[model samples]
Target: KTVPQKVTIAKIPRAKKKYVTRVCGLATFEIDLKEAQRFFAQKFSCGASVTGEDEIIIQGDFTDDIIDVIQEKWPEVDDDSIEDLGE
Candidate 1:
C-alpha cells in the first residue's frame, strides 16, 4: 500500500511586514521543483525558487492565494493533505 504525502506550507517572517512562504514535501507529489518555481513566479509575479531539491521558497505571504491556487492547479494533491504549519 502506498502511503499518503503532505504538502507543508509555512510562513516565515522576513521583516516587519514581509513574509516568505515555504513549501515543502511537494516534490513527493511527482512535481518538478524548477518548473513549479517558474510557474509560481509567473503566477504570483514574485521571486520563487527551489533552493533545496524538495522545497520551494516563494516571496510574500500569499497564504490563502498560494494554497487555493496549488489545489486548483494540481488535483492530484489531496486538499486535506495540505498542511499549513508554523509562523
Candidate 2:
C-alpha cells in the first residue's frame, strides 16, 4: 500500500500581536489550493489564500483549532504527519 500523506500547520508571528496560520505539505495530496482557501474561509470566518501552490495562508490565530479542522476535513491524513510548528 502507498504511504499516507501529511500536512503541517504553522503559526507565524506578526506585528502588533497578530498571527498568521499557514498550512503546508499539500502538494503530496494533490489537493486544490482553491478548495483549501474556501474551507479555511468558512471555518475561520476570515481571509484565506493559497500562496505559491503548496501553502495555504489563513488570517487569524487559529493554532488551537487547526488540527481538529484538518483531521475532520481530511480523515486520511495521519496524525503523526500533522506537524504543529506554532510552538
Candidate 3:
C-alpha cells in the first residue's frame, strides 16, 4: 500500500487588521510548523495561528505575491498549481 502525501500553502486572514503588524516584512514557508510560526510572530509582532492540520495562517495580505514566491521556491509544482486564480 502506498501512503498518501500532500503539500499545501498556508492561509492568510482576508479582512481583519487585528492580526496585522508591520514589524515583520514577509513570511517564509518551511517543513516545520513551529519554526515558521516563530519567525513570523517574533518579527511581525502578530500572533501565529495554526489551522490544526498541517498548515498555518498568518494575518496579512499576500495572496498574489506569495503565489509567485511559492512557484519560484518549488519549481516542480507546475503551472496548474500556480495558475492565476482570478481567471
Candidate 4:
C-alpha cells in the first residue's frame, strides 16, 4: 500500500502585479518534472518550470485550471489533499 500524495497550490506575489502559481509536494511522488512542466505549459499556454525538488512554478494565476488538470491526470490524489493557499 502506498500513501496518497499531497499537493499544495499557492500564489507567489511577483513584481509588476504578477502572481506565480507555486505547486509543491510533488517531489514525494515519482513524477517526471520535465513532462509535468510541459503539460502545464501547454495546458495553460504559459511558462512552467520545476524548482527546488518537486516544486512547480507556473507563470500565471491558473489556480482552478491547475486543480482540474491535476485531478484529471492523477486521480489517486484526493481533492482534499490539494490545498489552495491562493487568494
Q: Report the number of the highest-TM-score candidate.
A: 1
lDDT tens digits by residue: candidate 4, 1-87: 997797656454343327788888765556677788888889888778776567888887778677878878877667777778855
Q: How do the residues 1-87 of candidate 2 rate in per-residue lDDT, one tens digit apiece?
A: 986696656553343328778899866677677887898899778878776548888877788989888878987667887878857
Residue range with the least summed lDDT across 10 consecutive positions in model 3: 21-30
Q: By the lDDT metric, which is better: model 1 or model 2?
A: 1
In model 2, state the lDDT of residue 18.
82
Clash-forming residue pairs, model 1: none
Deviation of model 2 at 38, angstroms? 0.5
TM per candidate:
0.75, 0.74, 0.40, 0.71
Order by lDDT, highest first: 1, 2, 4, 3
**Better by TM-score, candidate 3 or 1:** 1
Residue 68 of model 4, lDDT score: 77
Model 2: lDDT of residue 75: 73
Candidate number that wins on TM-score, 2 or 4: 2
Mind sharing the TM-score for model 4?
A: 0.71
Give the clash count for each candidate.
0, 0, 1, 0
lDDT of 2 at 68: 84
RMSD of 4: 7.4
lDDT of 3 by residue, 1-87 (tens): 976696656555564764332212122323356665675567446566554345556666445455564456455555664443444
Per-residue error (Å), model 3, residue 53: 1.4
Ranking according to TM-score, highest score first = 1, 2, 4, 3
